[PDB]
Design a protein around this ligand. Structure first.
Ligand SMILES: [Mg+2]
Ligand SMILES: [Mg+2]
Ligand SMILES: [Mg+2]
Ligand SMILES: [Mg+2]
Ligand SMILES: [Mg+2]
Ligand SMILES: [Mg+2]
Ligand SMILES: [Mg+2]
Ligand SMILES: [Mg+2]
Ligand SMILES: [Mg+2]
Ligand SMILES: [Mg+2]
Ligand SMILES: [Mg+2]
Ligand SMILES: [Mg+2]
Ligand SMILES: [Mg+2]
Ligand SMILES: [Mg+2]
Lengths: 60, 143, 262, 62, 203
RNA sequence: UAACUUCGGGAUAAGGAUUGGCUCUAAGGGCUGGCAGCCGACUUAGAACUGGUGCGGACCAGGGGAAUCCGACUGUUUAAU
RNA sequence: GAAACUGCGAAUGGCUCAUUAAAUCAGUUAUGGUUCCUUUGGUCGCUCGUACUUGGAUAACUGUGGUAAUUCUAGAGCUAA
RNA sequence: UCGCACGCCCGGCGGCGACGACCCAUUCGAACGUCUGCCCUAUCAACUUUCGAUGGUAGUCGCCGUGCCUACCAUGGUGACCACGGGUGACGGGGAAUCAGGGUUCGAUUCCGGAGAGGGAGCCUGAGAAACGGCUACCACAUCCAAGGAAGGCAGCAGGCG
């Protein structure tokens, strides 16, 4: 499950490959346009809150 | 007498509620040299579909026929008779069409078998497109 | 069908355009305008088939899109603009003026006129009509609306309009004695003095009229277009003067003109 | 819808009786006295002359 | 969908007619508005030619004209009491053309007070009302209101409706298509016709 | 609502739909002095709402069709096979 | 001056004859019982109540992507009438 | 809102157009109506009606007239002068062939009018569509597929199978 991360203040964005279910428990069962603290996304991710803007499905 | 229906019956133009300390009635001449019957002026009935007292205008064709049945209410049926020429035999062939016509209650003495003059109008109902404009009594039938 | 038509077959075109059969499948459909489709004459037909200033449809498009053609005092860039009775075609660059007038047959004839005659035109009124605040109106046969007319103008009169200002200069009252031109029917193009006015309530009134040779002919009132007091036209009449010569003496003058010409 | 005429016409008509000796010998005179090519040249001339007669006869009754 | 067409029903003789074309766009119907009484709600419908029609779905106010005095005021609709077409259309409170409704007396009572200077209805007189009926009035206009007294007498039938606080009106506009509930105040012979119909209906 | 028929039947043929509760509406009459007043008694039709589609809720209460044999039918008969 | 927003057109034309028997259609008339883009002509300070020009989005574009696949589209950044 | 010019006064005035707008006429129409007109069949003689049939009143809906539909009423309407039902190897007409005078047969076919886009039904936008080289279903047929899904309508021009 790829993660498409965009930071509008600097206007920069990149794609992050993540494959660990333990790291994504914070995201599941959450609707779109909800704010989630991404502290469990890794060691570089503390103090970040990321809004979910919706992605694609396995079939696109 | 007149108010025999659920809604109040009146002519749409006459305002009958003027402050005072006989009802005036609307009527018109329909043209084409047709004389408005007297009992349409001193009468007391009302009718949307009466040519002399309602909002129907006479246009189109002016036809004639003979009365056949008078069982419907404020509408009768006349019968038009004519001949149809067939070229092969050089002969004619009697044909007839009978048609529904709205008889205003001003033409009050109408029997079976007299000649009426009908003028085309707005389509009044499913099968009625004509009003009676004058009635001529048949031969004899005066007594 | 499912909407308004936009084409016109040649064989279904009005006959007086004199369109042929083998040039094409389609005929120029007149654009919507002041004149009816069957009684008009598209600008395409006038320049390519009558005057022959062009040869094809593209050549006339170049002519009218250089703003050379001025119809009724206004510049028109529509190749299919419908020009009808009494319209003044004015091609200023070549120094030439026209007025569409029916000839003795059912056709629009080319009729060169002087520049002083091209400043005005006659037009039949169709309606008398009161505006929003008591302002009188009238409607001409070519769909002009003009306010505050002379109160003595009635529904069948004709008026003289100055094409620069569009205002009435003088009018002719419809009554017996006045000269007339027939714009429609089996007698169109004929000229005569109105003789009688027989009116049918509900139906169409008929007008009896006799030409300068004593021949009498009738027509419906909707085809009557008065063009002068007494027997003096207010316009210049074309060749033949609106006298329809029968087939018998048409050949008699055709060959006698031929043996006069050799 | 195409732009062409389709207006055509036959210029002759065959006789009803095919094998009449009197008729055969009379149109063999003409075809040899005028050097014609077949009977259809004789037939189309009888046919044009029949139009002229048919026009006059209906005019004469007028 | 809904069709207003003549080809789907029997001929004059009574024979079945077989259609030759399917349903057309211009032969369409739309669901009935069924205008109730309540806070104002109109939806607009785009109709043939690009025009507009206004579906009044809930409608509470409407201006009615008092014909005998030519006084047209905006009034609030109370109730529907009679309908000549259907008794089911008065059990539900739906406004259709030519249905007898109740409207309040207040806009007309004010006008009569300030135009004739008489009390109508009014079986204590509050300060605002007593002063308009007893204001310091010069003579020059006193006779004006005094000659206006001659025709100040209204019909008896209207009088007890004024002291009751509400009038009987008849809707003349078509609220399901115009979006308005306009009409006129009943009076005269037409008033007594609808009064005995309402009375005898109750039984 | 069929075959057939002694034209009487077959026939409740066969086959379908509906059915509660509640709130209403309309029609159907007497007596006294085309109107008014005072009295009524039960029925039928229609509508809105409403219930976990449930309603002839227990009781009562025809399975049907296509043919053959015999006796026309109703009736009677070996009390104890 | 590509691209994209905007406006218009795509209801014409072309093909075929299955349906259709007072239906279609034809001639004749009515809309004084109606809609009408467009063209032409009129109207367009008639109203008695920030204008030296108001607002925030969104394509085209840059950039990050998904699906085996479509004239499929998502999230981010700008900017016009 | 936009473009060409470019001037005149003592910053203010200026010409010619383009585009757009409410309304009225006009044009192109469209839609409902009027009257008369059609092939064969009686082994089709009675048909239509509380599942609108024919009228009345009040309304709803519709761009408007109208059983178009609703409520309440009346019992009407058509037929031997051929109704109603059925058949058509029936799209109608202007026309075509044959013809002395009469007629008989043909008109799928280039012009006008109708209808339809595999069969039905329902809509969006639009002045104008119940549109199919527009959309949404169901039926039949049929295409690609990673098996999760996507896509379709030649009675247009060619061309192919039958
Ligand atoms: Mg004969
Ligand atoms: Mg077409
Ligand atoms: Mg049985
Ligand atoms: Mg046996
Ligand atoms: Mg027995
Ligand atoms: Mg025993
Ligand atoms: Mg069939
Ligand atoms: Mg067929
Ligand atoms: Mg044909
Ligand atoms: Mg179609
Ligand atoms: Mg096919
Ligand atoms: Mg379709
Ligand atoms: Mg196609
Ligand atoms: Mg198409």
């Amino acid at each position: 499950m790829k993660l498409n991360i965009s930071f509008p203040a600097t206007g920069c964005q990149k794609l992050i490959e993540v494959d660990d279910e333990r790291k994504l428990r914070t995201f599941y069962e959450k609707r779109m346009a909800t704010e989630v603290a991404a502290d469990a996304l890794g060691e570089e991710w503390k103090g970040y809150v990321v809004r979910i803007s919706g992605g694609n499905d396995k079939q696109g | 007498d007149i108010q025999t229906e659920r809604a109040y019956q009146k002519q749409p133009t006459i305002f009958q509620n003027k402050k005072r300390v006989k009802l005036p009635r609307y009527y018109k001449n329909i043209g084409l040299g047709f004389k408005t019957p007297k009992e349409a002026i001193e009468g007391t009935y009302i009718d949307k579909k009466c040519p002399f007292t309602g909002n129907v205008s006479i246009r189109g064709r002016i036809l004639s026929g003979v009365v056949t049945k008078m069982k419907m209410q404020r509408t009768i049926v006349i019968r038009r008779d004519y001949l149809h020429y067939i070229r092969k035999y050089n002969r004619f062939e009697k044909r007839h069409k009978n048609m529904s016509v709205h008889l205003s209650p001003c033409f009050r003495d109408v029997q079976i078998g007299d000649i009426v003059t009908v003028g085309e109008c707005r389509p009044l109902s499913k099968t009625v497109r004509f009003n009676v404009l004058k009635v001529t009594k048949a031969a004899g039938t005066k007594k | 069908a499912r909407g308004p038509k936009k084409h016109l077959k040649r064989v279904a075109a009005p006959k007086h355009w004199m369109l042929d059969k083998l040039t094409g499948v389609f005929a120029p459909r007149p654009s919507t305008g002041p004149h009816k489709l069957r009684e008009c004459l598209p600008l395409i037909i006038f320049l390519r088939n009558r005057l022959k200033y062009a040869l094809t449809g593209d050549e006339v498009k170049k002519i009218c899109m250089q703003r050379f053609i001025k119809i009724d005092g206004k510049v028109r860039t529509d190749i299919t603009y419908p020009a009808g009775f009494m319209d003044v075609i004015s091609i200023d660059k070549t120094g030439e003026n026209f007025r569409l007038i029916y000839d003795t047959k059912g056709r629009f004839a080319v009729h060169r006129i002087t520049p002083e005659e091209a400043k005005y035109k006659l037009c039949k009124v169709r309606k008398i009509f009161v505006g929003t605040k008591g302002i009188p109106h009238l409607v001409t046969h070519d769909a002009r609306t003009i306010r505050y007319p002379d109160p003595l103008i009635k529904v069948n009169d004709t008026i003289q309009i100055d094409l620069e200002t569009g205002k009435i200069t003088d009018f002719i009252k419809f009554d017996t004695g006045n000269l007339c031109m027939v714009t429609g029917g089996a007698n169109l193009g004929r000229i005569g003095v109105i003789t009688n006015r027989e009116r049918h309530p509900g139906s169409f009134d008929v007008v009896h009229v006799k030409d300068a040779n004593g021949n009498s002919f009738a027509t419906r009132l909707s085809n009557i277009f008065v063009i002068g007091k007494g027997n003096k036209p207010w316009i210049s009449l074309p060749r033949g003067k609106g006298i329809r010569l029968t087939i018998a003496e048409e050949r008699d003058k055709r060959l006698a003109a031929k043996q006069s010409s050799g | 819808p195409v732009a062409r005429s389709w207006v055509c016409r036959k210029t002759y008509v065959t006789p009803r009786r095919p094998f009449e000796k009197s008729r055969l010998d009379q149109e063999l005179k003409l075809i040899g006295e005028y050097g014609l090519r077949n009977k259809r040249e004789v037939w189309r001339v009888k046919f044009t002359l029949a139009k002229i007669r048919k026009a006059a006869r209906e005019l004469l009754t007028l | 969908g809904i069709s207003r067409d003549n080809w789907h029903k029997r001929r004059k003789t009574g024979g079945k007619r077989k259609p030759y074309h399917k349903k057309r766009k211009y032969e369409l119907g739309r669901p009935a508005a069924n205008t109730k009484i309540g806070p104002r709600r109109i939806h607009t419908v785009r109709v043939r030619g690009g025009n507009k029609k206004y579906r009044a779905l809930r409608l509470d106010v409407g201006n009615f004209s008092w014909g005998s005095e030519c006084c047209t005021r905006k009034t609030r609709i109370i109730d529907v009491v009679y309908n000549a077409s259907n008794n089911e259309l008065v059990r539900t409170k739906t406004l259709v053309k030519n249905c007898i409704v109740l409207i309040d007396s207040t806009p007309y009572r004010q006008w009569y007070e300030s135009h004739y200077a008489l009390p109508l209805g009014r079986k204590k007189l509050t300060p605002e009302e007593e002063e308009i009926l007893n204001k310091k009035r010069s003579k020059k206009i006193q006779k004006k209101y005094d000659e206006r007294k001659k025709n100040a007498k209204i019909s008896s039938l209207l009088e007890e409706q004024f002291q009751q606080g509400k009038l009987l009106a008849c809707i003349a506009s078509r609220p399901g298509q115009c979006g308005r509930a306009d009409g006129y105040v009943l009076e005269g012979k037409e008033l007594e016709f609808y009064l005995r119909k309402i009375k005898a209906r109750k039984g």
